[PDB]
């Protein structure tokens, strides 16, 4: 059929005329297949013969596609597509199953010949003209245009979806209790009706769709109990991911490890605790694609613990809008966090992991707050509300960091839960200079031509030291100069730097860095009992900084 | 007398196309409020459902008119504004008056409801398309475009401007000293009257607007009380090596801005290589220096002026204890205005309040909103900002993650 629905008006882009691309000569077999296909389409009204007056043509061909030994008609709409207006959206988001609510029954109805069932605008039909060529293009071809949405045309996906939405609206208004999800060609239909009353409601939906020209040639409401969709298995009362045979191999190419990591990342939305950092380490510096990478020991631990998690099937439950969502987060390694979302303890709607990347230098309190933000955004999308959090951080740890830190934050309601390891702050800088602690005026310079450097200090106690440095830079020499002071000082120390950069780094209390010098510095800060770090401007002739500037720069620059 | 008035032709900027900005996800209660607001607007003819042949999109949000009062829809026309406003603000600009900021009192009155009286040019309508999304992507998204001038669009006051002039004329003739400025959906109304007569005059002016499609419109700013005197030098300043060292950092920073700051005499005194906790055996040519520096930090910055051809930018720092500092400049550290915002909880909530207050000041002073450098993670700002937003405009913003000891100087 062809739907009686009103057409969507379509246009070409500003100042563009339609396509006029010459038909190429085809083999005799392909001509004959096309003649037969177009005869059938024309009888159904899909297509209409037209005159040689209509200028405009787009090439057509045929092949054996999805093994089509009956033969399939293909139209190369590249030129028309370049010339056609942009349409809404296209599709820009799919549901997550953990957002659905439990149903008694769901059925899928596949709409037969979906695009060919929807009328095309008509003022636009002329631009879809095509020609079945003569043998050797010796004589004039048989010309047609489309009356319906064509298979490879730019507007077919959105016009189809728009038409389906309009067609479903009166049915949904009469049946406010039935849920319908439209995905390409398919319709998923869920209700809370008994098996027999559901079956009748489906037959009603099929007769309503028939009235609007859409057949569901799937008689008696087809597809079988566990539905496969977008890498999930859906049941009316639970969901999971679809497979995940992890191979049993001694040799793993880069291709196999990439594939494995994708499957593990995918399973991790319902299998709690999945881990891929060590498998991920193996992918450092792409060694090709067919190259075998031996599994490191930490990688071997990881794959073992993953197989163990994938041992027995695990399903998520669906969402009950009467209840709060609870999200729990655990620190699960080094870059790594893992979370679970549930409404009744232990029955996860879903799970996930977060492996933060936000800066070269961070700490656990920052990273946890980031995981919490990611989870917050996720919940809004999936359930349209925020969850209550359970976090492995004491309230006093969190509020001391955030009230003292220079960036704004806020997070939903949350409670402490004791699931080690707990997030803490591994050292704290003093607020005021330390009475009786030695003061180290540190300074670094590099040349920039030679990359020759120096880093040292002068102390209120007259102590002094410079060390040579080699393939370094200004920023590195400031850091090394602070590290040198920490190495040579006792348990309490005041450090006076003229580096904003260093101070900026150290003030944020990192516990982790992508700079090795910085991680060295952090280890020292953790051993200290007290450190006050202060800043002064370079070359102001400030006492102390004056002097170290003079010995770190006699060599340097 | 019950049919349409005539449309002003609107062009998008030369060679540009309409906006195609992603709708953000919304909470369930916000979605429900918008669907109800939009069913009503559509029943009144203000907006119409559109089909897939419109590929444009502008984000929409729900906020409160006050505290859990009623919901209001807020359309984020920032992109359509840019695409209409290399060429508007020039074809149909509203001049900004320099006497506004000199008034004892300025009231802000929302006049946006008036715009819905005027038909939007049929050919521009598609560019105002927006979407009410569904939760979990379960359902495509409700799509509409406007038939009338929309509230957050800079073309609306530009176009309504001839009507506003006529509406306001008898009132401005009767009160020649009242300054009235229109920005976006609001009027800013300044006078030097005592506070009770100021209010009686605003009530009068409300009666005028009422006859023309506004329903009892609306505050109180006191911009003649808006202050300089920021950067502050301590009084127990000259006691420790550390105090004096912090002092010199604050002055070095300040000499980037203000001509004439010194510090020479202060650095002497730091003379040796001393314990940070030591108290000091001078303060004399240093006390004089410190006093003169303090005198210059009271006064405006000698060589910095507003350039109407340039963006304003605002920086804000979290000071702690519910205090926030900010600066507005067009060229980094040539400050045109500095100030403070304080409560005495949240952080994101205080921050969105600071932003709205700074933007309002900026509109009063320059007729422009600033682009903000906000001290917050983007995602966190994006999740939470509409919870506390109550204004009808939205400034540009960027997110800033670094904060030199700029915090300390301020
Ligand atoms: C499978 C299931 C479980 C609970 N409620 C539903 S409602 C629905 F069937 F329409 C529906 N089918 C869908 C398929 C993918 C995405 C959303 C769906 O909603 N569906
Ligand atoms: Ca240095």
Description of the molecule:
The PDB classes it as hydrolase. Chain A has 557 residues and is α+β, with helices and mostly antiparallel strands. Chain A has five domains: 131 residues, HIV Type 1 Reverse Transcriptase, Chain A, domain 1; 94 residues, Alpha-Beta Plaits (2-Layer Sandwich), CATH 3.30.70; 94 residues, Alpha-Beta Plaits; 107 residues, Alpha-Beta Plaits; 130 residues, Ribonuclease H-like superfamily/Ribonuclease H (Nucleotidyltransferase, domain 5). Chain A is 30% helix and 20% strand. In chain A, the strands form seven sheets. Chain A has a five-stranded mixed sheet with strand order 14-13-12-16-17, covered by helices on one side. In chain A, strands 20-19-18-21-23 form a five-stranded mixed sheet. In chain A, strands 1-6-5 form a three-stranded antiparallel sheet, with helices on one face. In chain A, helix 10 packs parallel to helix 12. Chain B is α+β, with helices and mostly antiparallel strands and 410 residues long. Chain B folds into four domains: 131 residues, HIV Type 1 Reverse Transcriptase, Chain A, domain 1 (Roll), CATH 3.10.10.10; 81 residues, Reverse transcriptase/Diguanylate cyclase domain (Alpha-Beta Plaits, 2-Layer Sandwich); 86 residues, Alpha-Beta Plaits; 104 residues, Reverse transcriptase/Diguanylate cyclase domain (Alpha-Beta Plaits). Helices cover 31% and strands 17% of the residues of chain B. Chain B starts with 27 loop residues before the first helix and ends with a helix. Classes of the chains: A alpha+beta (557), B alpha+beta (410). The interface between A and B is large, with 75 and 63 residues.
């Amino acid at each position: 059929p062809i739907s009686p629905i009103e057409t969507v008006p379509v246009k070409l882009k500003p100042g563009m005329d339609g396509p006029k691309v010459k038909q190429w000569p085809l083999t005799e077999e392909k001509i004959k297949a096309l003649v037969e296909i177009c005869t059938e389409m024309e009888k159904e009204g899909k297509i209409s013969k037209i005159g040689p007056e209509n200028p405009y043509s787009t090439p057509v061909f045929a092949i054996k596609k999805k093994d089509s030994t009956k033969w399939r008609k293909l139209v190369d709409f590249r030129e028309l597509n370049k010339r056609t207006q942009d349409f809404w959206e296209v599709q820009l988001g799919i549901p997550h199953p953990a957002g659905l609510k439990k149903k008694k029954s769901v059925t899928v109805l596949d709409v037969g010949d979906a695009y060919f069932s929807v009328p095309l605008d008509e003022d636009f039909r002329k631009y879809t003209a095509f020609t079945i060529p003569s043998i050797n293009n010796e004589t004039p071809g048989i010309r047609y245009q489309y009356n319906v949405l064509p298979q490879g045309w730019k507007g077919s996906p959105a016009i189809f979806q728009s038409s389906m939405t309009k067609i479903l609206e009166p049915f949904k208004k009469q049946n406010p209790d039935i849920v319908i999800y439209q995905y390409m060609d398919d319709l998923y239909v869920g209700s809370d009706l008994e098996i027999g009353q559901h079956r009748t409601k489906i037959e009603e939906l099929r007769q309503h769709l028939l009235r609007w020209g859409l057949t569901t040639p799937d008689k008696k409401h087809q597809k079988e109990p566990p539905l496969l969709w977008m890498g999930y298995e859906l049941h009316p009362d639970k969901w999971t991911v679809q497979p995940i045979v992890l191979p049993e191999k001694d040799s793993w190419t880069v291709n196999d490890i990439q594939k494995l990591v994708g499957k593990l990342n995918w399973a991790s939305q319902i299998y709690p605790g999945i881990k891929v950092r060590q498998l991920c380490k193996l992918l450092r510096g792409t060694k090709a694609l067919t190259e075998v990478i031996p599994l490191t020991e930490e990688a071997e631990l990881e794959l073992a613990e993953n197989r163990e998690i994938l041992k027995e099937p695990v399903h998520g439950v669906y969402y009950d809008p009467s209840k709060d969502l609870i999200a729990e987060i655990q620190k699960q390694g080094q870059g790594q966090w893992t979370y679970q979302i549930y409404q009744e303890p232990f029955k996860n709607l879903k799970t996930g992991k977060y492996a933060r990347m936000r800066g070269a230098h961070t700490n656990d309190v920052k990273q946890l707050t980031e995981a919490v933000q990611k989870i917050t955004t996720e919940s809004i999308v999936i359930w349209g509300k925020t969850p209550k959090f359970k976090l492995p951080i004491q309230k006093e740890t969190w509020e001391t960091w955030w009230t003292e830190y220079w960036q704004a934050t806020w997070i939903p309601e949350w409670e402490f839960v004791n699931t080690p390891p707990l997030v803490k702050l591994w050292y704290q800088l003093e607020k005021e200079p330390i009475v009786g602690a030695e003061t180290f005026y540190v300074d670094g310079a590099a040349n920039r031509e030679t990359k020759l450097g120096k880093a040292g200090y002068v102390t209120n106690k007259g102590r002094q030291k410079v060390v040579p440095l080699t393939n370094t830079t200004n920023q590195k020499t400031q850091l090394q100069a602070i590290y040198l002071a920490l190495q040579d000082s006792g348990l309490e120390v005041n450090i006076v730097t003229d580096s904003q950069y260093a101070l900026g780094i150290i003030q944020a209390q990192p516990d982790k860095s992508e700079s090795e010098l910085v991680n060295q510095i952090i280890e020292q800060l953790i051993k200290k009992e007290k450190v006050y770090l202060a800043w002064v401007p370079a070359h102001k002739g400030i006492g102390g900084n004056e002097q170290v500037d003079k010995l770190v720069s006699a060599g340097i620059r | 007398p019950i049919s349409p008035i005539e449309t002003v032709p609107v062009k998008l900027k030369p060679g540009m196309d309409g906006p195609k900005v992603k709708q953000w996800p919304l909470t369930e209660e916000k979605i429900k409020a918008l669907v109800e607001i939009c069913t009503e607007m559509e029943k009144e003819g203000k907006i119409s459902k559109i089909g897939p042949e419109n590929p444009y999109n502008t984000p929409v949000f729900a906020i409160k008119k006050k505290d859990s009062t009623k919901w209001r829809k807020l359309v984020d026309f920032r992109e359509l504004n840019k695409r209409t406003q290399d060429f508007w603000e020039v074809q149909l600009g509203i001049p900004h008056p320099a006497g506004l900021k000199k008034k004892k009192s300025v009231t802000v009155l929302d006049v946006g409801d008036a715009y819905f009286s005027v038909p939007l040019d049929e050919d521009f309508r598609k560019y105002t398309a927006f979407t009410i999304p569904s939760i979990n992507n379960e359902t495509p998204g409700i799509r509409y475009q406007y038939n009338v001038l929309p509230q957050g669009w800079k073309g609306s006051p530009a176009i309504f401007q001839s009507s506003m002039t006529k509406i306001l004329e008898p009132f401005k003739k009767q009160n020649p000293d009242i300054v009235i400025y229109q920005y976006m959906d609001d009027l800013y109304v300044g006078s030097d009257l005592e506070i009770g007569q100021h209010r009686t005059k605003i009530e009068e002016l409300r009666q005028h607007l009422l006859r023309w499609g506004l329903t009892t419109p609306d505050y109180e700013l006191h911009p003649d009380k808006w202050t300089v005197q920021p950067i502050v030098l301590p009084e127990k300043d000259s006691w420790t090596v550390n105090d004096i060292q912090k002092l010199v950092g604050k002055l070095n920073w300040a000499s980037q801005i203000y001509p004439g700051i010194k510090v020479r005499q202060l650095s002497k005194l730091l003379r040796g290589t001393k314990a940070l906790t030591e108290v000091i055996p001078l303060t004399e040519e240093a006390e004089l220096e410190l006093a003169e520096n303090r005198e210059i930090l009271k006064e405006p910055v000698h060589g910095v002026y507003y350039d109407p051809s340039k963006d304003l930018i605002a920086e804000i720092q979290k000071q702690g204890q519910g205090q926030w500092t900010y600066q507005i400049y067009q060229e980094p550290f040539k400050n045109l205005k500095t100030g403070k915002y304080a409560r005495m909880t949240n952080d994101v909530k205080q921050l969105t309040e600071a932003v709205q207050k700074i933007t309002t000041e900026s509109i009063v002073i320059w007729g422009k909103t600033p682009k903000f450098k906000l001290p917050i993670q983007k995602e966190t700002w994006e999740t939470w900002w509409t919870e506390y937003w109550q204004a009808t405009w939205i400034p540009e913003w960027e997110f800033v993650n670094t904060p030199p000891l700029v915090k300390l100087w301020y």
